[PDB]
């Protein structure tokens, strides 16, 4: 713990601390201001017997001659215990819920690991999220990044509780635990997330780490990082299966974005620094199971879409490091829809590896796709169908886009606190589509069970 | 007190060596003229400053002198009734002691009157342990609002001299024996207006807000704590929405921020605020309101500080146990000025010119509102409301700064002219508009009314909504068309306009609604409603319903003018709908 | 010639009415004593002509004085200037006028310094003679284009479409020297003429004085190829 008195430029958040030694690429700083006050930061570079910083909270009210700098040793590190379930921190992980402890067992850097590709293991099996739309169309497996696009005004916060609550694994022997971002949101919404966590008890089982709109964007930044650092932990040294859930990540690259024009980086497309593709690479690559050990790592990843624009850098590029996406429309959400998932544009790229008999039940892979080509010629039934109205309705084509109807309104519309057990989803699939003859249809041994 | 001396002068940028006794955001006067800057940089003993005012005729040689502060407010009784620039510089005492009608380079005065004598009557004993927000007296500053002195941020102990007596804010009121020995207390204290002043804790903004304004109270309200965002269109009243949440609202003060507005625009508010009458006093408005006025022409800097300047004040209050309302009109231009500042020192832009930071300053500003528990033994609890107006131009919300703030406020009232151009008025938009506040709401009032409330607001939202479904079908093709389930909802729909959403400021009456009144009002509404549908089922017709009750819906037309002593005669008019469709019931 | 700024509970609220005799801006979009009433136009569109018209035609409806005319000139060709000038001649109009002519071969500081010379006038002749000022300066385009030079010059670092970050500030610092004056006679009510570049309505220069102005008045080309005169 090496002390220096010796700051020589402050220029806006940076500093330059002369006369230095020993001082590390990346290392934490505390800054301890000529007032009493405490600021954390981070060396950017270090060259000769100089180390330029940046503050976290800003460099406002310090006195440089009578300030010093205390260079701690070690990177943003998180300290990790297994009496991390039930507790609630914020970006750094410090205690925000004023309860006792808590003594580390060790401390990793936030950063993490690289997986050698040989001990990478394929993710396995399905995770019951109880919401239909997601468990049926749009499967859910054990170490997978699926993604929910959304919006902004759209009740993706109220999906993110739900899936906390009701996502489980059924059945295994293997603990189950949720490790839970938030990401620069509201004090309102936090509240919100404290609240219902704590009403239905998923906390018992979940870690929380609470970002706020208002905390610096460094804590921001590296928020889903403490996130993914205790999940590791759970999943790879405790042998648990951990799903972890992150909002919003459009207010995370707001926060990379912010961060790059403080260190005088010249922007890449679109405003973001070339590096967002990388970045969030290092986010998401670190879900999965290894080979030999029991638990995993599942990403669900929500992030709200600016101008809802699909090629925008920042759900364009989480697309392309993703496996899938759940999207969430106005359209739907407008008619009352929750949760408004449009399971047309929605995609699972490993449903496959996560269904079917034993995983979930024999009928999975054909009730989706005749769900699925169902609600397609049903929506079509009723685009051109406004515009030549119900002036004459079909009788095969108006017998389709009811199906179309009620598969909104009773098979997707579940309700925000509606956990629908997969047995239950699949037995409602069946019940919508006994509104098509037989010649419309998944193959002969239909009516069997 | 150390003295720097100018070494380059270059546009709004200065620097002066020897400044090492000063800080990062330290305030300055520059030069021989003393003209305000900020420090922004340093490098060993070199100062950069951002000079405020212009530069032109400074250069080497002259000296800067560090206010020993950042950009901070003086608070404290005096405060009350003025008109602030963005920076605290008070704009009458500026007339009368410079005898000018220009604002002159590096003319300094204080922000509140330090001659005047004021009578603090002590509240606190000798021998008391006190800390932060402890209240130790008060002042009865305006007609209305009594100032109550506090202990400052920063100061633990024991009283040891109190006393009750005339003083001026300079005067010491009190001694505190703390650790560090003996330390005076006056009437006012310094806050630097970037920091948000400390709080016990935050509450969740759950009391509902009352306006007197039916569409929002009932509709799309807010929480005292909450925050609600503007359009501001030409021509669809705003101004006047303004003056009646001013005016009417359940608030202790406000506080009333122009941004850096077209200069005819802000003397309009100059000469407008003051002639606001107070409803419970008669007295004027200015008696429990602190303006800050900004036209586009003022420094960048205090078009950029206006809010926080703003915020900072309301947070004052707040701490002394009050229910304090900022309006900021309007933080379009705000954000302009962030936006200059952030050209100015040679920043990357983030999008459309605006700062990479644009977003984080903005829930800065938000998250500094709220219900909070104030500092103190006596655990009192305040608030801030915010009421923001944004202006983007053309009127289109999908830019940056509408953009942010929707993301992090919660109540949206979108006025619109084209309701405006219709007659109908507060021009609402009740499609677009919404409060993420209903719902908690809804269970206060189902609470505090014993009353089913929330139903009554969802049905008459549901009848909203279905007439924007049932016009497109009207349109094309036909009005005479439409079953008699739909024209009778066409009808209440008109009725939830007409008789209730529209609202005259202008009327004795009208200008105000209270809960109460509120309630019954629409509860006459949706029983007419109620004893159609009844009505139609039991075979009676349409054209008939209206024909038969033209006298008892005048009735409920002239709902909004009766006096609130007279609620009975709201109530009565069930009746008259019952005893009226039962008898066409034949 | 920088002048100070305008206190603003100092600021009086324009009240009366000018007739510039043309039916859209008197009518439609009423200038009013004291209010920054702007035209944007483009290149080739005839700007010009609206402004000499205005200029000789506004007067109030009351009892006086007449208004005194302060016309700036900045950046213009030795044709649109010459226009002006044999306009003001032949009418009568200079014996009311005071005329700052700065032209496109003229160096870009001069050009920087044009309105500031003549708002400086017209603030005299206004607030210290207690007369009623009106101002009409064309084109602020120039003005702009003429900040951008300098600024290059300067060795700055651009804002928003190549324009300093500073532009909104100094437009600002021309446009709010306006208005009446609580206890003052005189008042000064501004025109500034402007060409959109590219015709667009977004682009800094128009934007910026649209938040800084109150309202604007826009000629088209499709009237003006009408033969629409003024093609507003």
Avoid at chain 1, 137 to 151: A, D, E
Avoid at chain 1, 394 to 406: L, M, P, Q, T
Wanted: contains cysteine.
């Amino acid at each position: 713990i090496k002390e220096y008195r010796t700051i020589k430029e402050v220029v806006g958040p940076l500093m330059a601390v002369e006369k230095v030694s020993g001082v590390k690429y990346e290392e934490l700083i505390e800054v301890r201001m000529q007032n009493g006050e405490i600021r954390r930061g981070q060396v950017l570079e270090v060259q000769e017997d100089k180390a330029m910083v940046q503050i976290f909270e800003g460099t406002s009210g310090i006195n440089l001659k009578n300030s010093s700098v205390r260079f701690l040793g070690h990177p943003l590190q998180l300290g990790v215990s297994e009496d991390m379930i039930g507790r609630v921190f914020d970006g750094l992980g410090r205690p925000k819920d004023n309860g006792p402890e808590i003594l580390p067992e060790k401390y990793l850097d936030i950063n993490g690991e690289v997986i050698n590709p040989i001990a990478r293991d394929y993710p396995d099996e399905f995770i019951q999220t109880g919401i239909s739309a997601i468990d049926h169309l749009n499967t859910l497996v054990r170490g997978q990044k699926l993604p929910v696009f959304s919006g902004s005004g759209l009740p993706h916060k109220e999906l993110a509780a739900q899936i906390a609550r009701q996502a489980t694994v059924l059945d295994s022997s293997d603990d189950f635990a949720v490790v839970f971002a938030a990401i620069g949101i509201t004090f309102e919404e936090a509240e919100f997330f404290m609240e219902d966590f704590r009403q239905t008890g998923a906390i018992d089982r979940s870690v929380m780490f609470m970002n706020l709109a208002n905390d610096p964007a460094i804590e921001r930044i590296a928020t889903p990082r403490m996130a993914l650092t205790a999940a590791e932990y759970l999943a790879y040294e405790k042998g648990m299966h951990v799903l972890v859930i992150m909002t919003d990540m459009t207010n995370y690259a707001e926060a990379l974005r912010e961060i790059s024009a403080a260190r005088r980086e010249v922007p890449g497309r679109r405003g973001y620094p070339g590096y967002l593709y990388t970045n969030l690479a290092t986010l998401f690559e670190r879900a999965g199971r290894i080979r030999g050990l029991k638990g995993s790592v599942t990403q669900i990843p929500i992030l709200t879409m600016p101008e809802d624009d699909k090629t925008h850098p920042i759900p364009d590029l989480t697309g392309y490091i993703t496996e899938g996406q759940i999207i969430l429309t106005r359209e739907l959400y407008k008619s009352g829809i929750q949760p408004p998932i449009d399971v047309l544009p929605s995609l699972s790229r490993l449903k496959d590896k996560g269904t079917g008999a034993g995983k979930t039940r024999e009928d999975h892979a054909a009730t989706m796709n005749q769900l699925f080509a169902a609600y397609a010629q049903g929506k079509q039934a009723k685009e051109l169908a406004v515009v030549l109205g119900e002036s004459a309705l079909s009788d095969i084509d108006k017998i389709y886009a009811k199906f179309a109807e009620r598969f909104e309104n009773e098979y997707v519309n579940q309700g925000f606190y509606t956990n629908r057990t997969i047995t239950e989803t699949l037995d409602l699939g069946w019940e919508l589509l006994a509104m098509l003859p037989r010649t419309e249809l998944r193959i002969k041994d239909d009516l069997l069970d | 007190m150390q003295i720097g001396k100018i070494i380059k002068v270059s546009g709004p940028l200065v620097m002066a060596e020897n400044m090492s006794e000063a800080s990062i955001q330290d305030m300055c006067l520059v030069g021989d003229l003393g003209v305000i800057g900020e420090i922004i940089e340093m490098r060993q003993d070199v100062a950069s400053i951002q000079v405020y005012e212009e530069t032109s005729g400074i250069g080497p040689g002259e000296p800067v002198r560090s206010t020993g502060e950042a950009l901070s407010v003086e608070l404290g009784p005096g405060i009350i009734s003025q008109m602030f620039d963005g920076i605290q510089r008070p704009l009458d005492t500026f007339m009368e002691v410079t005898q000018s009608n220009f604002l002159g380079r590096g003319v300094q005065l204080p922000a509140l009157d330090h001659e005047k004598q004021w009578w603090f009557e002590a509240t606190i004993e000798e021998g008391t342990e006190v800390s932060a927000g402890d209240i130790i007296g008060y002042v009865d500053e305006t007609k209305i609002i009594q100032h109550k002195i506090m202990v400052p941020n920063g100061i633990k102990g024991t009283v040891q001299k109190i006393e009750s007596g005339s003083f001026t804010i300079d005067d010491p009121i009190c001694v505190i024996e703390t650790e560090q020995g003996l330390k005076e207390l006056t009437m006012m204290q310094k806050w630097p207006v970037r920091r948000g002043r400390p709080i016990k804790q935050k509450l969740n903004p759950d009391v509902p807000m009352i306006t007197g304004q039916r569409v929002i109270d009932t509709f799309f309200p807010v929480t005292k704590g909450g925050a609600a965002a503007v359009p501001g269109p030409f021509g669809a009243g705003k101004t006047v929405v303004q003056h009646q949440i001013a005016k009417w609202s359940d608030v202790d003060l406000v506080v009333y921020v122009g941004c850096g507005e077209r200069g005819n625009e802000m003397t309009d508010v100059v000469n407008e605020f003051p002639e606001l009458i107070d409803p419970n006093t008669g007295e004027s408005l200015m008696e429990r309101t602190v303006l800050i006025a900004n036209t586009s022409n003022m420094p960048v800097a205090a078009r950029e500080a206006s809010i926080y300047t703003g915020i900072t004040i309301a947070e004052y209050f707040r701490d002394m146990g009050y229910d304090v309302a900022i309006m900021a009109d309007s933080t379009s231009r705000w954000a302009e000025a962030l936006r200059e500042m952030s050209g100015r020192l040679e920043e990357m832009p983030g999008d459309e010119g605006y700062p990479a930071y644009l977003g984080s300053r903005l829930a800065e500003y938000y998250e500094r509102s709220g219900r909070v528990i104030a500092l103190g033994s006596d655990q009192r609890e305040g608030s801030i409301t915010a009421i923001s107006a944004v202006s983007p131009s053309g009127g289109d919300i999908s830019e940056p700064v509408t953009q942010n703030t929707l993301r992090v406020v919660k109540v949206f009232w979108g006025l619109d002219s084209s309701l405006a151009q219709k007659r109908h008025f507060p021009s609402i938009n009740w499609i677009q508009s919404y409060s993420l506040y209903s719902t908690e709401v809804g269970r206060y009032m189902d609470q505090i009314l014993q009353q089913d409330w929330s139903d009554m607001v969802t049905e008459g939202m549901r009848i909203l909504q279905e007439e924007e479904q049932l016009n497109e079908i009207v349109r094309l093709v036909g009005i005479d068309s439409l079953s008699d389930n739909d024209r009778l909802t066409l009808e209440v729909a008109k009725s939830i306009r007409e008789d209730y959403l529209q609202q005259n400021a202008f009327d004795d009456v009208d200008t105000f609604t209270s809960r109460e009144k509120q309630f019954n009002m629409l509860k006459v509404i949706l029983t007419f409603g109620k004893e159609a549908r009844k009505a139609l089922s039991l075979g009676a017709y349409f054209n008939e319903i209206m024909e038969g009750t033209v006298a008892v819906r005048e009735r409920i037309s002239r709902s909004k003018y009766i006096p609130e002593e007279e609620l009975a005669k709201i109530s009565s008019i069930n009746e008259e709908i019952k005893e009226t469709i039962q008898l066409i019931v034949s």
